[PDB]
Write a protein that binds this ligand. Structure first.
Ligand code: HEM
Ligand SMILES: Cc1nc2ccc(F)cn2c1N
Length: 289
């Protein structure tokens, strides 16, 4: 099963920078969402969930087809809460209806990371909307109530190694859990991209507890929380070494996250030899906007 990237007809870097800017301007304008966290974190999560359905074995799922727009995927219990990100992107799509759905969802995540002061994430266009019967079944996204062995095995399906996994999980510094979405709650909240996930793992005093949804989670007396899968990154000795590396080197974390996140968003896509080079978008700040 081959998905060849096909550039939206007549579009170039400038066209996509305009879409980036519209997303970024709306992030600034709709600042009140989720108790003033804003839409940044949920857009990052949306980009990951549309990509994380991928299966390397048969090239099903992945970001290419934009299939989150169909009810089966939209209503995946694993995707509860992401409807907010979809609703955010709706007026963007109306302003730029030429962009494919997969390109819009993935660009939303890139824009959110960069506007939240994260690393630059190179991004490629050319995802093409595929029909409803290409939507992956529910159940391909990861469970949170598991251990390091589960995490490691799960991410092999996405062709991610230990370093890539630990780097990607640093996104859990962003946003927060919501009891009504996932059965996890707490840990305060944040909308600036940093390496604080790793610092909190290492520096906080953690205690395993059951929450009000009867689910296990690790809680600190500072009020932070870790999922069992988050905490597994310091229980496993191979993950722990990488956690320490990122806790002690902000730039290295940024660079490795950028590579892993681009890879995540591009898994399953075949790019022609003469496809455009990846785009690196300027932030609003860099443009004086
Ligand atoms: C073992 C892997 C993972 C598990 C089990 C997991 C699980 C979860 C859960 C349960 C939530 C709470 C959702 C809610 O209640 O609204 C969440 C939120 C979030 N996840 Fe993950 N996740 C994983 C990997 C990732 C990755 C790889 C990324 C991105 C690179 C990511 C980005 C996010 C973000 C940004 C949020 C905050 C969303 C918001 O504030 O609305 N996660 N995740
Ligand atoms: C601040 C914060 N953000 C997240 C995102 C996902 C997750 F599972 C936990 N998180 C915590 N504690």
């Amino acid at each position: 099963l081959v998905h060849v990237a096909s550039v939206e007809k007549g579009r170039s870097y400038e066209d996509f920078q305009k879409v980036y800017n519209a997303i970024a301007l709306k992030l600034r304008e709709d600042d009140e969402y989720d108790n003033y966290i804003g839409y940044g974190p949920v857009l990052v999560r949306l980009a990951w969930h549309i990509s994380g359905t991928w299966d390397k074995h048969d090239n099903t799922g992945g970001s290419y087809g934009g299939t989150y727009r169909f009810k089966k995927e939209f209503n995946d219990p694993s995707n509860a809460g992401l409807q907010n990100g979809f609703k955010f992107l709706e007026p963007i799509h109306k302003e730029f209806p030429w962009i494919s759905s997969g390109d819009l969802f993935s660009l939303g995540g890139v824009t959110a990371v960069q506007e939240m002061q994260g690393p630059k994430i190179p991004w490629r266009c050319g995802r093409v909307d595929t029909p409803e019967d290409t939507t992956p079944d529910n159940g391909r996204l990861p469970d949170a109530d598991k251990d390091a062995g589960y995490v490691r095995t799960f991410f092999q399906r996405l062709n991610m190694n230990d370093r890539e996994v630990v780097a990607l999980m640093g996104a859990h510094a962003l946003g927060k859990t919501h009891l009504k979405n996932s059965g996890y709650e707490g840990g305060g909240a944040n909308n600036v991209f940093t390496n604080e996930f790793y610092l909190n793992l290492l520096n906080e005093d953690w205690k395993l507890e059951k929450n009000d949804a009867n689910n296990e989670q690790w809680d600190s007396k500072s009020g932070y929380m870790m999922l069992p899968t988050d905490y597994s990154l310091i229980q496993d000795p191979k993950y722990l070494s990488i956690v320490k590396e990122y806790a002690n080197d902000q730039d290295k974390f940024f660079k490795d996250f950028s590579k892993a996140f681009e890879k995540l968003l591009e898994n399953g896509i075949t790019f022609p030899k003469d496809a455009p080079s990846p785009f690196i978008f300027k932030t609003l700040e860099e443009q004086g906007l």
